[PDB]
Design a protein around this nucleic acid. Structure first.
Ligand SMILES: Nc1nc2c(ncn2[C@H]2C[C@H](O)[C@@H](COP(=O)(O)O)O2)c(=O)[nH]1
Ligand SMILES: *P(=O)(O)OC[C@@H]1O[C@H](n2cc(F)c(N)nc2=O)CS1
Ligand SMILES: [Mg+2]
Ligand SMILES: [Mg+2]
Lengths: 391, 548
DNA sequence: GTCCCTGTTCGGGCGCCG
DNA sequence: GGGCGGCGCCCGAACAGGGACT
């Protein structure tokens, strides 16, 4: 028995062209789709359905998992434990398979259309639509919510300390237990469901000022610029005295000794950079912006904010590697880590401002995706100034 | 006959009606061809005579085909097309012969009168009405209706599905109604399977006329001649005109881009630049010297004989890239060293300012996705860029960039960064504090500098902008400094441009700047916030502000 | 806000296939 | 002569976004 769903008023369904898949992905998709259609989960369709949503596959194991980029459909589809961010360990189970049991509103099926492509365009694309709740669709956890609650009732009663949160395809299970009997409890929950993260170790990456025993006109000029920008975030920051050292037209390399006033100003600003940002409240009605900066040498900084300079969180991803490093792979790993953190903290995924060319990103990011969700993103060709401020 | 495939339901767009357009006059030859076609189609039930019960009508004509006496019957369904619902096109791309694997036995077939063998949704037939100077309606797919390509391609896929499921190891390239059929069978068993396929297709209402049943090589297919172990493109004929119009140039460049898929070294930058800000196709553009030279070189290239090979999946895919000038690149994709699978050109200009490493990166990207389409895998690269060049660039560039498995190749022009900003300021070198200001109302500006050695200069400018004046200040410092110089700007605009290390700009001023930067031994560019009283910057700001 | 500049999309023309 | 769909290419005309200015 199905549940009717509409789109948002004034909106049509997704019309997103499929991107080129590799042979291994098309093969995995064809085999998976054959099985899915044998089981009545999907049906073949043709050109008279005007909608489309790209599909691909990820190898998490020698089994592939189909992944549908429902970002658009999700935007267009009709419309949280604050203690989960504190569990000693949190495990992430894929429970999307559940959704293949609930039927899908017939009038809605046309919006879940997708196309399997062909190597070298041997054939036209071969199109399908869904007859059950699709994985990767906002509506699937929503409609399955009641059955999920009934399924998880006795496990939560028998484990009142454990926090079980759901985000779209995944169960985030959080405990303060030692990671060994924790794994025991997770296998209890997986056996029960026939019917590894550590948020207490996440930390803020603060702004840091250079420690020097000799300062040049260049050093002080760079400091004043950094502090000027930082003051937009910490209004307590003061530059008047350091800037006073710069009067005149001096050679960049000239050594300038700090006065007493400027040394105290720098110590005060040093302390002010430790205090937490004042006046930053999470707005559920707004998106989460996540900016990433590539700092070089496998170092990445990021900020999660909703209004400019109101950072909900700042952090870094530091995969220390030089010999053979893949900026794109690292960047998609960073994106997945940041998204995981945001899902855990706020239950939303961020919109990413990615420091990459759109084409490079779109060429390679599917080679490294490992998550069942996909965040919004845009591509910035953004400046080296903010890059310098977060290093 | 008519295919017993179930029809595909098609609606008009929300709240619309069928076409009500009056016919136009037709020639005697066109009317005779139309009437012969129409009585023959009426016998077969592909068109049904209609009377007063049909309000709608839309125009009809015919054109000569590539076969001699056969006329193609066409309808101007532009109005119906407007009113007809949207489809998802299922033809995602064009098959390419470099993507074919060697087969023991090959056949090429065409389906005759293909659209006219697939039934049209009964409800929709009435909107397809037309007269002949006799009133008919379409019972099959018409030519010129926007739904016909996709409906036919999908219906053909459905029609072939049982033969493909029964013969998974026979490869059938299915472009619209054209089939290429490859098998690892000895020629006799293959021919039997082909008779099986033709009987299968005919069972589904598709006839394969023997006149278009190619049994021996070479096969004519998709613009190519397929030989047993090599393929070629059917000949290309560039016009040999003297007065070139925008249409003439569009044709020339389209044929050249088509040729570039197997002819190495094709360049169309100069012929393409020749089209900027055009009025109409009929305008006569005069060939600039550089376009004349480039067209000559292209002609020479095309005089050579060339071929591609077929894909061997048990080997590596290799792509080698060479740089030509002006942001142009060609590439050869091969598996064995002198046997190109195919070739190509990348020449797209991304960005006001760029350099050869960015351009190379985006050529690598374009080639990578093109390879994923044709062969389903990424190729291994051979690039004229030293691993150290790349390492430097990836180190110091603020954006995530990456090139897949590659190997340096020593064929010039090697790709290099043409200058290198200092990471630290230069001791002893003169320090220029630069600024510009522009008056938004008058568009007068000043650019200039002070220096720690006491020099100061202001250049006035007319018809300028703030960004232009910031650049002119940097350019003025480069002009008046020596081989080593520190420069302090308050302009993150100019800083971002110059840190990016461009070797080419569409801005003449940025190019002059670039030339200066290439001439210098050491250059350090530093940034400071404007209007905060910072020492050197304050005096320049006071100098260039005087006019504003 | 406005002006300037930069990047992206999308629709026009041609080529090629059918 | 002209109708259609696909893909390629290039260009210009809309936008969007961000920095600088009054
Ligand atoms: N708030 C503010 N107003 C300014 C500043 N400079 C000029 N104005 C004002 C003065 C005038 O009334 C107005 C327009 O003058 P403009 O055309 O030079 O702008 C400034 O730095 N801040
Ligand atoms: P195919 O049917 O094998 O014909 C060869 C080329 O096709 C061109 N053609 C085909 C077609 F289906 C439509 N609608 N237009 C068109 O020009 C003519 S020669
Ligand atoms: Mg203060
Ligand atoms: Mg300025």
């Amino acid at each position: 028995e199905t549940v009717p769903v509409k789109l948002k008023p004034g909106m049509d369904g997704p019309k997103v062209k499929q991107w080129p898949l590799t042979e291994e992905k098309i093969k995995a998709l064809v085999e998976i789709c054959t099985e899915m259609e044998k089981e009545g989960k999907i049906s073949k369709i043709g050109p008279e359905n005007p909608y489309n949503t790209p599909v691909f596959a990820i190898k998490k194991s020698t089994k592939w998992r189909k992944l549908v980029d429902f970002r658009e459909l999700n935007k267009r589809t009709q419309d949280h434990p604050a203690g989960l961010k504190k569990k000693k360990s949190v495990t992430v189970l894929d429970v999307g398979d559940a959704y293949f049991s609930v039927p899908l509103d017939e009038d809605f099926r046309k919006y879940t259309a997708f196309t399997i492509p062909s190597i070298n365009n041997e054939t036209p694309g071969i199109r399908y639509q869904y007859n059950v709740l699709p994985q990767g669709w906002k509506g699937s956890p929503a409609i399955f919510q009641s059955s999920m609650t009934k399924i998880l009732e006795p496990f939560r009663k028998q484990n009142p300390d454990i926090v079980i949160y759901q985000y779209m395809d995944d169960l985030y299970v959080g405990s303060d237990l030692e990671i060994g009997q924790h794994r025991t409890k997770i296998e209890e929950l997986r056996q029960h469901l026939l019917r590894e993260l550590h948020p207490d170790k996440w930390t803020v990456q603060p702004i840091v000022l250079p420690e020097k025993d000799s300062w040049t006109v260049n050093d002080i000029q760079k400091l004043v610029g950094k502090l000027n920008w930082a003051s937009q975030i910490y209004p307590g920051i003061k530059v008047r005295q350091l800037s006073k050292l710069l009067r005149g037209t001096k050679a960049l390399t000239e050594v300038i000794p700090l006065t007493e006033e400027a040394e105290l100003e720098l110590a005060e600003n040093r302390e002010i950079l430790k205090e937490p940002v004042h006046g930053v409240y999470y707005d559920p009605s707004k998106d989460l912006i996540a900016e990433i900066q590539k700092q070089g040498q496998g170092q990445w900084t990021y900020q999660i904010y909703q209004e400019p300079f109101k950072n909900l969180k700042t952090g870094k991803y530091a995969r220390m590697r030089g010999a053979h490093t893949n900026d794109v792979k690292q960047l998609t790993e960073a994106v997945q880590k940041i998204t995981t953190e945001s899902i855990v903290i706020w239950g939303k995924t961020p919109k990413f401002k990615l420091p990459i060319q759109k084409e490079t990103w779109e060429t390679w990011w599917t080679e490294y995706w490992q998550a069942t969700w996909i965040p919004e993103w845009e591509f910035v060709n953004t400046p080296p100034l903010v890059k310098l401020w977060y290093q | 006959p008519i295919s017993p495939i179930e029809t595909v339901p098609v609606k008009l767009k929300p709240g619309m009606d069928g076409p009500k357009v009056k016919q136009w006059p037709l020639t005697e030859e066109k009317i005779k061809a139309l009437v012969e076609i129409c009585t023959e189609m009426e016998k077969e039930g592909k068109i049904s005579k209609i009377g007063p019960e049909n309000p709608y009508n839309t125009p009809v004509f015919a054109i000569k085909k590539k076969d001699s006496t056969k006329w193609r019957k066409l309808v101007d369904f532009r109005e119906l097309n407007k009113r007809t619902q949207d489809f998802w096109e299922v033809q995602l791309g064009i098959p390419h012969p470099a993507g074919l694997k060697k087969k023991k036995s090959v056949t090429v077939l065409d389906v005759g009168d293909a659209y006219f063998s697939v039934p049209l949704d009964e409800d929709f037939r009435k909107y397809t009405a037309f007269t002949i100077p006799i009133r008919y309606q379409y019972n099959v797919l018409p030519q010129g209706w926007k739904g016909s390509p996709a409906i036919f391609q999908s219906s053909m896929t459905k029609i072939l599905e049982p033969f493909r499921k029964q013969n998974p190891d026979i490869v059938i390239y299915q472009y619209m109604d054209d089939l290429y059929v490859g098998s690892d069978l000895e020629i006799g068993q293959h021919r039997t399977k082909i008779e099986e396929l033709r009987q299968h297709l005919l069972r589904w209402g598709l006839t394969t006329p023997d006149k278009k049943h190619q049994k021996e090589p070479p096969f004519l297919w998709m613009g190519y001649e397929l030989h047993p172990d090599k393929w070629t493109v059917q000949p290309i004929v560039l016009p040999e005109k003297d007065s070139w119009t925008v249409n003439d140039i569009c044709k020339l460049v389209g044929k050249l881009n088509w040729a570039s898929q197997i002819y190495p070294g094709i360049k169309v930058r100069q012929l393409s630049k020749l089209l900027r800000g055009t009025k109409a196709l009929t305008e006569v553009i005069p060939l600039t010297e550089e376009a004349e030279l480039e067209l000559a070189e292209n002609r020479e290239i095309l005089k050579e004989p060339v071929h591609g090979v077929y894909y061997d999946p048990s080997k590596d895919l290799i792509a080698e890239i060479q740089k030509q000038g002006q942001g142009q690149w060609t590439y050869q994709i091969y598996q064995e060293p002198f046997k190109n699978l195919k070739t190509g050109k990348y020449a797209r200009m991304r960005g006001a300012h760029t350099n050869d490493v960015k351009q190379l990166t985006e050529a690598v990207q374009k080639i990578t996705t093109e390879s994923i389409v044709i062969w389903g895998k990424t190729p291994k690269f051979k690039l004229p860029i030293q691993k150290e060049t790349w390492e430097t660039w990836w180190t110091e560039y603020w954006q995530a960039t990456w090139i897949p498995e590659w190997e340096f190749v020593n064929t010039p022009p090697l790709v290099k960064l043409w200058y290198q900003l200092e990471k630290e300021p230069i001791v002893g070198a003169e320090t220029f504090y630069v600024d510009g200001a522009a008056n938004r109302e008058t568009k007068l500006g000043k650019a200039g500098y002070v220096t720690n050695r006491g020099r100061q200069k202001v250049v006035t400018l007319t018809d300028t902008t703030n960004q232009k004046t910031e650049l002119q200040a940097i350019y003025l410092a480069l002009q008046d400094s020596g081989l080593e110089v520190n420069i302090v700007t308050d302009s993150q605009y100019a800083l971002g441009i110059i840190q990016a290390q461009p070797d080419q700009s569409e801005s003449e001023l940025v190019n002059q700047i670039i030339e200066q930067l290439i001439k210098k031994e050491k250059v350090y560019l530093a940034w400071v916030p404007a209007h905060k009283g910072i020492g050197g910057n304050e005096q320049v700001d006071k100098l260039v502000s005087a006019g504003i």
